Every structure is written in C-alpha cells, then in structure tokens.
Point group: C4
Chain length 233, copies 4
C-alpha cells in the first residue's frame, strides 16, 4: 500500500488534501497527539517514539487508545543498537516490558546500505537523522513503494513534556539515498514546505478528506507513578 | 482436551462433582499438596510454582512423586521475564538446574495480547494476577478450549512454609480478557464460590468422582540442606 | 556400533578378551595414557576430560597424537552447565579456544530424564557420578545400543598430575537408570571386578586381541608454559 | 573464481604479470593503499584490517571509496574470538557499528581443522600467522580453489600510522596445512620472493596488465575526531 509519513512541523497543518492518495496507511511520531485537529485521521498504521521517552509515550498511547483518541496497529521504538544513543539493557529486555511493541531497529537494520550510511555519518561526523527519515527507512523495510511526506520542515511547550525533556542537509541527503538505493517513490504533500524545494509533489487527484476537530483531547505526555519508574529502572 | 485449573481457596473442597467433565487434565499450584483429600485426584497434568520458592517446591515435588502422593506430567515455574518480579540469572540457567521443568513464560508469552495486558497493568498500575489466572493463560497457550475453574475465591500455617515465606477485580478482568480474546470457554465448578457471580457454571452431567482421603501425607514444604542452598546461590 | 567404555580402575588390566565384541569404538578418560600397555588399542572413538584439567589434557593429547601414541576421533570436555561444578566463562567461549573439541554437555543434555536425575541428586544430595557413567550417558546420546564396561571398580602418582590436582551406589544406580530408561544393553568385560556383582557379563565369543606393550611413553600430564596459562586465564 | 591475495611486502612491486591469471578477484590488507601504483588495480574483492586499527581503517576506506581511489566488495575485520587477541565487546556489537563489514572469523571458523591448528599453536606456543595466511583461510572458506600469492616476504613510516601503532616457518607451515587439508592450489606470483623457495610458481600465460601510477593519493591512515573516538569507546 501507500503510506503518509508525518513529522509534526508546521506543514502538518498545510497539507493539500486534493493530493491525498485516498487509500493509505499513516505513520506518526513523538508528540503527534498534540495536533489540534485530526490532520491525518485517528487511525495510524504505526506510531514511532524515541527511546529516551519510550516508557512515558507508551503509557500515554495506551491512554489515547483507551480514551479512543487514536488507534494504531504498530508501536515502534526508534532505536539504533548503539550504546551512545540508547540504553542497551532496555533494548535487550524490550519485548518483555512491551510485548505489543517493536524495536524499530529490527526493520531499520534490514536496509543494510542505509544502516551503513547512517552509522558512518553519525559515529564519525555526528550527523543525525530526524524521526521522519527513520520512519521512511522503516516504511521501505516494511515493503512500501510510495511514500508521501508531510510535517517535515527544517526546522508544543507543554508542562509534562518540558519536565521530561527540558529541550536538514542530513535529512534531504538521507531521503535521496533511500529513494535512489531502494527504488521507491517519495512525494511531497505540503506545497508550502521547504521540503517541496527538494521533493516531487504528490499529484493532484482532487481528493477530499474530512479534518475532524479535536476537543478536550490529550495534549501533553502523561507521567507514570514513581513506583512505575522504580520498576522500570 | 478439557482442563480443571485449581487454586487452593476454600472452594476447592466445595466442588459440585456432578458437573465434573469426566475426561480432563488437572493444573495445580503452590501448596496444593496441603489438601486433606484428593479433591481432584493424584494425577496432575501440570503443577505451577512461584519463582521465589521454586527451589524448595521442586525438591518437595520430587519427594511427593517418589512417595507416590502425586504424579505430574509437567512442572512449571510461573515467571514473567521482569527483573522486579524474579531473579533473572535463575531464569537464564533454569533448564540446566531443572531439566525436566518448564519456565511458564515460554507458554505465557505466546499470548501476545494478554502478556501486553498483564505487563501494562503491573508495571504502571501495580496490578498483579494470581496463579489461577497465570494457569488459564498457560492452559490457553497449550491449546485447551474448555477450562473449568475451582479453588479461586477472593480471597495453611505450616512451619517450613512460614519459615520461607513469612507472609479480584484484576483477576476477573483478566479472565474475561482471556475468554473474550482467545475464544475459549470458562466454566465454574464451585457454585458456592464468589467466582460464580462472574463465571458460567459447568453444566450438570450427573458425573461421579471418588474423593480419596489422605492419611500420613506431606502437608508442609520441605527444606533443602544448606549445602544444597549454597550450590543454588 | 558397539562401544567399550573404560575407566582406568585396576580391572582395565583384567579384561577377559575372549568376550571382546571385535568390532567396537573405544571411549577413554582422564589419565588413560598412563596405561602401561594398549589394553584397548591406540585408536579411541572419544577421550573425555574433566573441565578443571581440560587445558592441560588438551595440550597433552595433542602431544600424544603427534607422538603417535594414540588417535582419537572426538575430544570431550565432561561438563554439566552448573556454576558450582565448572567455570562458565570457559564453557561459553569453549569452541573458540578448542575448535576441534566438544562440550560433553551438548550430548549429555539430550538425555533429559538422566540429566534431571543427575541434577536433582547432585544439587540436593551431593551425589556425583564418575566419568565412566558420564561416558555411558554421552554414548547413549550418540546412538550406541550395546555398551561394554571396563576399568570401573569402586574405587598414578605422577609429578605433573600431583602438581595440578593435589588429590558406587550412585554409579550403579545411575547405570541402571540409563539401562532401564533408554533401553540399551550394558555388558561387563571384567569378570573379577565388583562391577560384575551388578552387570551382565559380556558373552564369550572366543575372540582374540593383541595387547601391544608400551615403551618410552607419555605417563604424566604435560604442563603448558606460563604464557599459555596467561592467555587462557 | 581465482583470487590474488596480497600482503604488502616488497615483492608486491615484483610481480611477474605474464603469470597473472587475467580473470581474478583481489584481496588486500592493512596499509595496502600506501602502494605508489595500482600493482593489482583499484578494484578489490575484499580488504582485511586488524581489529586494533579497524575503527581508523574503516574511516580511511570510506574516504578511499568516496575519493575513488579504490573499490571493494567486502570489508573484513581479521578477528579470532580470543580475549587476549581482540576486544570482545567490540566483536559482539560489530555488525551494528559497521553494518556493511564482516568479522573475518565468521569465515575463518568454517575451516575447523585450520582454526584448531591456529588456536593450538597460538595459545600454547605463541605462534601467530600474518594477514596473508588469514586471507588464504578466509579465501578457502569462501569457496576459492586457486589462490595466487604476492607481497608475502619474510619479512611505510607515515605520521598518522606511527601515532596509532608506534611499531615465516609459522606462515609456510600454515599455508602448507591449508593446501594439504582443503585441496586447493597455491601459486606464487613473485619469482624473486623467498615465498618462491616454498610455493609453485603461477604458470606463464604471457598475460598483460596495465600498472596505473598513483598521483596525489592517500598514503597515510586517517584519524577520526575525538568525538568519534568518544562514541566508539
Ligand atoms: C529537543 C529535541 O532535540 N527534540 C527532537 C528533534 O530535534 C527531532 F530529533 C525530533 O522531532 P519531533 O519532535 O519528533 O517532530 C517530528 C518531525 O516534526 C518536524 N517539526 C516539528 C516541530 C517544528 N517546530 N518543526 C519541524 O520541522 C520535524 O521536521 C521532525 O522530523 C525527531 O525525532 O525527529 O524529535 C525531537 C524530540 O526528541 C522528540 O519530540 C521527543 O519525543
Ligand atoms: C503470601 C502471598 O502473597 N501469597 C500468594 C498469594 O497472594 C497469591 F499470589 C497466590 O495464592 P496461592 O497461595 O497459590 O493459592 C492459589 C489460589 O488459591 C486461592 N486461595 C487460597 C487460599 C485462600 N485462603 N483463599 C483463596 O482464594 C486463590 O484464589 C489463588 O488463586 C498465587 O500465586 O495465586 O500465591 C501465594 C504464595 O505466593 C504462594 O502460595 C507461594 O507458594
Ligand atoms: C582426585 C579425584 O577426585 N579424582 C577423580 C575421581 O574421584 C573420579 F571422579 C574420576 O576418576 P578417573 O581418575 O577419571 O578414573 C576413571 C575411572 O577409572 C576408575 N578407577 C581408577 C583408579 C582406581 N584406583 N580405581 C578405579 O575404580 C574409576 O572407577 C573411574 O570411573 C572420574 O572422573 O570418574 O576422576 C578423577 C580425577 O578428577 C581425574 O582423574 C582428573 O583427570
Ligand atoms: C607492527 C606490527 O606488528 N605490524 C604487523 C605485522 O607484523 C603483521 F602481522 C602484518 O603485516 P602487514 O603490515 O599487514 O603487511 C601485510 C603483508 O605484507 C608483507 N610485508 C610487508 C612489509 C614488509 N617490509 N615485509 C613484508 O613481508 C608481510 O609478508 C605481510 O603478510 C599482518 O597483519 O600480516 O600486520 C602488521 C600491522 O599489525 C598492520 O599493518 C596494522 O595495520
């Protein structure tokens, strides 16, 4: 099938929906549930979370799912099997703590050339990709052929999130490598994004999509009990 | 086949045997051999022991077997692959210390949805299931379709046991999840149990069963030599 | 095929060779090369060494092989996968230090019932079997059906050996368990041994065997250089 | 196919190219890119690097590849799975740091007899082989039948290299073992080498080969940033 992969850059709001493929799977990441409307609908094929907040994102997702704000078929931890990037003890026992989730690296490492590319530039040059690229890589490994990009921009101030994380060339070069090496097609869904300097626009299909508005929704990350943190540590 | 799973609640004594399936396998747990009579016969399909007393239960079982008080085809350690719940070094080398036994988690983890369910509520909410649920989960993973419950109540003071261990909604919710998710049937064999507020009675078959009385039997856990403990540590 | 398994008890010298099967494989152990004559010939199917002297026995064997005193097809380390019995780091990397050798436990653990039997009595009762039983167990796992025993007695004072190691019911019970459980046949080749109180004599076949005498032979264990010991530590 | 394996001894310059097989794969090692001319062409089937400089050779190779000085299909780390010879933590996570490279030991250990041979003499006698032998062993494991040797001599002073590494019978005996045991053929391409006392000359085929000269080339090992070293440590 087709996949729309979203970062959560301002252009997430600036999709041209006449270009929306209309049968598609959706990939979301990180604080996607901060969106003020369902810019891509409620149903995700995969959501992707950074290893350093995976424990709190998983807890929050289960609340979104049960509160019926979103559904997802897959839950990914966006890992790389590198000690300087993530806690290895957590990776080793992951499937036992989170039996319905997946380490993204099980799919990422299937792209041997891109994994080699990524590693070489990160270890030796400190060049890092964003979730939106990691997601294209996992999407390619999953067998997707047409990938439609949105919310990727170059380049939220919620209380809980601020308390846990008090915090382009690389991306475009990576995305080009992927496209060139694996022979899939990349499209750009956001004409007013800088991504559109670099990526061929999704074609107009005069498609429609209803953007449902969100009211009384979850717009910050949840924080587990101390006793939960004690178990996980 | 059919399985009767027993906890050792007071209702173990209060089975309505007219409802007993009459070809069945039996699952027992923990201090089941404290029973003052053979309420389910001598022959077990599986006995299940908590990891923290597994070393002393295994020793005791071998004595029951050789003293011909009980037989069992399988011996399970009821583990979960969680550091805060059990000693991981012991899990890793288990099959070498106990080559005729099984880690229950090899079967429990086959129920991906229930394992996810269990983990999420235990890690984040401190909700724990009892052996009787763990046993239904292992029974489902083993391919059983009709499961008859007894000795589960909501919710023994022997010397050796006291020296080693100086010591419902969750259960009913778990059992419902299992039944709903795996499409097996749960029956209740003890009409006078609270379990019967929640679980459909096993149907009357006017079956008979002989309850053999126990005399001069093993009714406390055995304690290994110090030298045995030294090896195991 | 048939196997003769030898301990190195006095009865090794007291074989009745009229009873020798005449097509057979030979299992030897430990300081077998101390024999003053080739009581079973030069050609071994397997030699078995205790883990605690495996490094010095392997070194010595390679010298026997190259000095053409003995040949062997297999080299076994007689291990059990138990921390209190052997060094586990050495077991883990064994095949990399000794790529032409085998951990005996890879075959021993194939006899699930005997492994369970062994473990239970050793861990809990401190009952240990001798190499001659370990060898029957490995021989059974290897597919042998007729096993002829010698040099097992119930129940050498060389310089190097003394410097490295300054040092029955269980056996007979184990051997009986093996015979009963795996349905192989045990024979006794040494009529004047106590083993013959317990084991059915190999039948007379009026077979002949030449006992070659040994002259100028290796009759103590060799000791590796310090630098070798430094690597191995 | 045929393989030319090169060490980088003086005889690398002294190939008799009339004897060059003319369809062949090339194996290079270590500081091969110091060559002042393309004595074997630019295209390598495999390059092999010692584990202790693998991090800096890999970085340097990627620069050679991108600077179009050389191409290679395979990148090998010449390891042995021995703690005293290499860092084991690095071996364990190798494929994640270097996803397009290979541990040479995955192929070397396929030659069970040679691996046994190597280990026995190194651990116990401190006899070590050179890269050129390690390379023949990997070449045999890879399915090569005819192996043409060069740059092996019995038995560079660049700044970066000097800063990282401030630094025959065994070889000939090993090469003979390989030839004898695996039934491949060894040839010698350098008539004026001592190797030719021991190895049958590649036959004259009056073949031609163009030796391209090298100008403005990479002739020392590159040194990664500190921050790269920090990640890798
Ligand atoms: C603090 C920190 O370092 N934050 C990083 C950020 O540099 C980047 F690594 C990324 O960005 P993330 O927030 O998930 O948002 C996902 C995508 O949304 C787009 N976007 C978002 C906001 C904005 N103002 N301009 C944009 O363009 C980006 O193009 C990106 O690819 C990522 O993983 O790619 O993740 C965050 C956090 O580590 C993460 O949110 C923790 O849950
Ligand atoms: C001290 C402590 O925490 N004990 C726990 C208890 O909270 C519970 F985890 C359980 O209960 P366990 O004793 O095996 O008994 C098995 C079953 O028998 C029923 N029953 C028993 C006695 C009673 N008076 N009312 C009852 O209802 C329960 O419904 C339960 O499912 C269990 O694993 O499910 O195990 C025991 C011990 O850890 C175990 O005995 C050590 O060998
Ligand atoms: C010091 C110490 O504890 N020694 C043990 C011993 O208790 C026993 F574990 C055994 O005996 P081992 O010497 O190999 O000899 C092998 C067989 O030869 C027989 N025999 C030998 C001499 C004798 N005088 N009477 C006999 O009966 C035994 O019946 C035994 O099965 C064994 O592994 O079975 O191994 C030795 C050493 O650990 C080993 O030699 C180190 O290389
Ligand atoms: C300092 C130190 O110990 N150096 C060793 C050396 O003893 C030997 F282990 C070897 O030799 P290496 O340099 O790669 O060169 C590869 C081959 O080139 C030949 N040759 C080279 C120069 C010369 N003057 N006479 C020669 O004969 C040898 O026959 C050898 O097989 C090896 O791995 O076989 O590797 C080097 C370094 O560890 C390596 O360069 C680090 O990258």
């Amino acid at each position: 099938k087709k996949v729309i992969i979203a970062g959560n850059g301002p252009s997430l709001k600036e999709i041209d929906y006449s270009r929306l493929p209309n049968d598609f799977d959706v990939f979301r990441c990180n604080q996607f549930y901060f969106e003020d409307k369902y810019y891509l609908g409620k149903k995700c094929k995969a959501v992707f979370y950074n290893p350093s907040l995976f424990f709190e994102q998983y807890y929050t997702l289960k609340h979104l799912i049960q509160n019926q704000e979103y559904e997802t078929e897959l839950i990914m931890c966006s890992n790389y099997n590198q000690a300087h990037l993530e806690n290895e003890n957590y990776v080793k026992t992951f499937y036992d703590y989170f039996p319905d989730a997946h380490l993204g690296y099980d799919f990422f490492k299937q792209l041997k050339d891109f994994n080699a590319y990524f590693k070489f530039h990160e270890i030796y040059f400190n060049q890092r990709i964003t979730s939106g690229v990691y997601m294209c890589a996992v999407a390619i490994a999953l067998g997707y052929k047409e990938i439609y990009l949105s919310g990727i921009d170059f380049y939220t101030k919620q209380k809980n999130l601020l308390k846990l994380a008090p915090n382009k060339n690389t991306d475009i070069k990576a995305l080009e490598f992927l496209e060139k090496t694996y022979k899939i097609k990349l499209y750009c869904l956001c004409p007013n994004s800088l991504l559109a300097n670099f990526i061929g626009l999704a074609p107009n299909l005069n498609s429609n999509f209803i953007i449902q508005e969100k009211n009384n929704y979850t717009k910050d990350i949840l924080i587990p009990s101390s006793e939960a943190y004690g178990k996980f540590s």
